[PDB]
Amino acid sequence: MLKIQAYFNETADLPCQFANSQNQSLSELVVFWQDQENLVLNEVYLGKEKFDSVHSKYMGRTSFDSDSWTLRLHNLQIKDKGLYQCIIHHKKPTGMIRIHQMNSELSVLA
Amino acid sequence: MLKIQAYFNETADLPCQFANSQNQSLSELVVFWQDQENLVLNEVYLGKEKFDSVHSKYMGRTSFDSDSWTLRLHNLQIKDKGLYQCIIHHKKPTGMIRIHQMNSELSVLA
């Protein structure tokens, strides 16, 4: 578990650290970022940013870099502290299978 | 390694994260904060801030929180990005013994 210390009103950059050794198209992956309550901050559904699974309280607050595989959460509040998870799935004909995950613990200092 | 993400012209909190399970006093300890070149930002020697070993580069720029045993590095510059170490020693009749270390990576963003 990676630990990140960030600051109130500023930003957190959370990473997935994914090597794509499996080596496939982002159009073949479902990537999302989940909080400790399993609510979704951000989803990249087969290469397309999606807001269908995103909790309304996270709307507008995040940005996913498809280069670094990193999520930026902006305008941090004390409440934003806790465990975050990056989960990466391969899309199959009938479902999807988890192929990677990375957890970060965030502190938000005053 | 704690990842600290803080901003230009702001202040970074460089923590020791030391439980102090033996309820020891600063007055029997020597605490150093050093950078990746092993240069010293500040020293608390048996409870007293001491600048004998502090590099010119850090003079005037630090403050110690004797409540949480954290050093704050003020008015951050991009140059300030890097590795930092809190190192706690217990003073012996001759010399001192290392009893705790906490390493942190500072990023400075804009």
Which of A96, A84, A85, A94 lies closest to A24 in space, CA to CA? A96
Calpha distance B45→B58 (Å, rounded): 17
Determine the distance from the C-alpha atom of residue A34 to the mean position of all C-alpha atoms in its chain, rounded to a whole number: 6
Which of B73, B102, B71, B105 lies closest to B85 in space, CA to CA? B102
Calpha distance B47→B33 (Å, rounded): 14
Cβ atoms of A10 and A72 closer than 8 Å: no
Domains and CATH numbers, chain B: 1-110 (2.60.40.10)
Which of A30, A48, A46 lies closest to A87 in space, CA to CA? A30
Cβ atoms of B14 and B106 closer than 8 Å: yes
The amino acid occupying position A33 is: W
User: Residue B102 corresponds to which tokens in the numbers above?
Assistant: 């906490």
Say what the resolution is, in angstroms. Answer: 1.9
- The answer to whether A7 contacts B5, with C-beta atoms less than 8 Å apart, is yes
Calpha distance B41→B63 (Å, rounded): 10
- The answer to whether B10 contacts A7, with C-beta atoms less than 8 Å apart, is yes
- The answer to whether A3 contacts B2, with C-beta atoms less than 8 Å apart, is yes
Compute CA distances B17 → A6, A85, B44, B87, B100, whole Å. Answer: 16, 24, 16, 11, 9
Which residues of chain B have a Cβ shorter than 8 Å from any chain A Cβ? 2-7, 10, 13, 15, 104, 109
For residue B63, the SS3 value is strand
For residue A54, what is the DSSP state? B
For chains A and B, CB pairs below 8 A equal 31
- The answer to whether B109 contacts A12, with C-beta atoms less than 8 Å apart, is no
